[PDB]
Motif scaffolding. Structure first.
Motif, PDB file in Angstrom:
ATOM      1  N   UNK A 173     -10.715  -3.126  11.921  1.00  0.00           N
ATOM      2  CA  UNK A 173     -11.248  -4.349  11.337  1.00  0.00           C
ATOM      3  C   UNK A 173     -10.786  -4.501   9.888  1.00  0.00           C
ATOM      4  N   UNK A 174     -10.341  -5.700   9.534  1.00  0.00           N
ATOM      5  CA  UNK A 174      -9.895  -5.974   8.176  1.00  0.00           C
ATOM      6  C   UNK A 174     -10.259  -7.392   7.767  1.00  0.00           C
ATOM      7  N   UNK A 175     -10.226  -7.662   6.469  1.00  0.00           N
ATOM      8  CA  UNK A 175     -10.461  -9.012   5.984  1.00  0.00           C
ATOM      9  C   UNK A 175      -9.250  -9.542   5.233  1.00  0.00           C
ATOM     10  N   UNK A 176      -8.885 -10.783   5.534  1.00  0.00           N
ATOM     11  CA  UNK A 176      -7.755 -11.431   4.885  1.00  0.00           C
ATOM     12  C   UNK A 176      -8.134 -11.868   3.473  1.00  0.00           C
ATOM     13  N   UNK A 177      -7.396 -11.371   2.488  1.00  0.00           N
ATOM     14  CA  UNK A 177      -7.650 -11.699   1.091  1.00  0.00           C
ATOM     15  C   UNK A 177      -6.786 -12.867   0.637  1.00  0.00           C
TER      16      UNK A 177
ATOM     17  N   UNK B   9      -7.718 -16.752   4.557  1.00  0.00           N
ATOM     18  CA  UNK B   9      -8.420 -15.851   3.635  1.00  0.00           C
ATOM     19  C   UNK B   9      -9.926 -15.885   3.859  1.00  0.00           C
ATOM     20  N   UNK B  10     -10.556 -14.716   3.887  1.00  0.00           N
ATOM     21  CA  UNK B  10     -11.978 -14.628   4.155  1.00  0.00           C
ATOM     22  C   UNK B  10     -12.280 -14.214   5.585  1.00  0.00           C
ATOM     23  N   UNK B  11     -11.326 -14.442   6.482  1.00  0.00           N
ATOM     24  CA  UNK B  11     -11.501 -14.115   7.895  1.00  0.00           C
ATOM     25  C   UNK B  11     -11.606 -12.621   8.162  1.00  0.00           C
ATOM     26  N   UNK B  12     -12.351 -12.280   9.208  1.00  0.00           N
ATOM     27  CA  UNK B  12     -12.290 -10.955   9.803  1.00  0.00           C
ATOM     28  C   UNK B  12     -11.208 -10.991  10.875  1.00  0.00           C
ATOM     29  N   UNK B  13     -10.320 -10.005  10.857  1.00  0.00           N
ATOM     30  CA  UNK B  13      -9.274  -9.882  11.867  1.00  0.00           C
ATOM     31  C   UNK B  13      -9.163  -8.443  12.352  1.00  0.00           C
ATOM     32  N   UNK B  14      -8.520  -8.250  13.501  1.00  0.00           N
ATOM     33  CA  UNK B  14      -8.213  -6.899  13.962  1.00  0.00           C
ATOM     34  C   UNK B  14      -6.764  -6.583  13.607  1.00  0.00           C
ATOM     35  N   UNK B  15      -6.563  -5.656  12.678  1.00  0.00           N
ATOM     36  CA  UNK B  15      -5.242  -5.415  12.109  1.00  0.00           C
ATOM     37  C   UNK B  15      -4.677  -4.038  12.461  1.00  0.00           C
ATOM     38  N   UNK B  16      -3.406  -4.012  12.846  1.00  0.00           N
ATOM     39  CA  UNK B  16      -2.748  -2.774  13.242  1.00  0.00           C
ATOM     40  C   UNK B  16      -2.306  -1.962  12.025  1.00  0.00           C
ATOM     41  N   UNK B  17      -3.035  -0.883  11.752  1.00  0.00           N
ATOM     42  CA  UNK B  17      -2.703   0.032  10.665  1.00  0.00           C
ATOM     43  C   UNK B  17      -1.777   1.128  11.183  1.00  0.00           C
ATOM     44  N   UNK B  18      -0.530   1.098  10.724  1.00  0.00           N
ATOM     45  CA  UNK B  18       0.507   1.988  11.233  1.00  0.00           C
ATOM     46  C   UNK B  18       0.866   3.064  10.210  1.00  0.00           C
TER      47      UNK B  18
END
Ligand SMILES: [Zn+2]
Lengths: 148, 8
Positions: free
Chosen positions: A91-95, A73-82
């Motif tokens: 780009x997304x952030x883990x909540x 949580x808090x990290x920046x990640x590259x997330x696949x939005x499908x």
């Protein structure tokens, strides 16, 4: 010898894409150099001039099932939005993260993420998550804690 | 470390 690969952000959609090649460069008096990019799995007609300092970075890493412990949580990640008409890496952030015991299929953990660009939120599996390379540091730490 | 195939 360690390979360094890059990803670049497109001005079309604001998504990040793997870079196959850097074709040329151009410099401006006002700053922010730009590089011509050929995208992986895309033809020449999709070539794009990209701001090097703000839209080119070291490649995000698709996660091994083991590496779920490096997604916090808090990290920046590259997330696949499908979606229905579109499926892109954003780009997304883990909540938050619900960590569950793995199985034969691999990681069963769920991650609540929030996409930086549209503020939309989604629960995703590890297979849709790409780590920033620096998180390897964490893994290295974890590897040092092992037995000899 | 293969990524998913992006669809524009
Ligand atoms: Zn997991």
């Amino acid at each position: 010898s360690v390979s360094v690969e890059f990803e670049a952000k497109s001005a079309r959609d604001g998504a990040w894409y793997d870079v196959a090649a850097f074709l040329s460069h151009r410099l401006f008096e006002s700053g922010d150099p730009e590089v011509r990019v050929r995208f992986s799995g895309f033809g020449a007609e999709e070539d794009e001039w990209i701001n090097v300092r703000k839209c080119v970075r070291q490649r995000s890493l698709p996660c091994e099932a083991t590496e779920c412990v490096a997604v916090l949580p808090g990290d920046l990640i590259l997330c696949f939005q499908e979606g229905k008409d579109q499926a892109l890496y954003y780009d997304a952030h883990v909540l938050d993260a619900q960590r569950r015991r793995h199985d034969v299929g691999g990681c069963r953990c769920r991650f609540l993420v929030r996409y930086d660009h549209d503020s939309s939120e989604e629960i995703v599996p590890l297979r849709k998550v790409c780590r920033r390379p620096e998180t390897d540091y964490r893994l290295q730490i974890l590897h040092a804690a092992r037995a000899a | 470390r293969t990524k998913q195939t992006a669809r524009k």
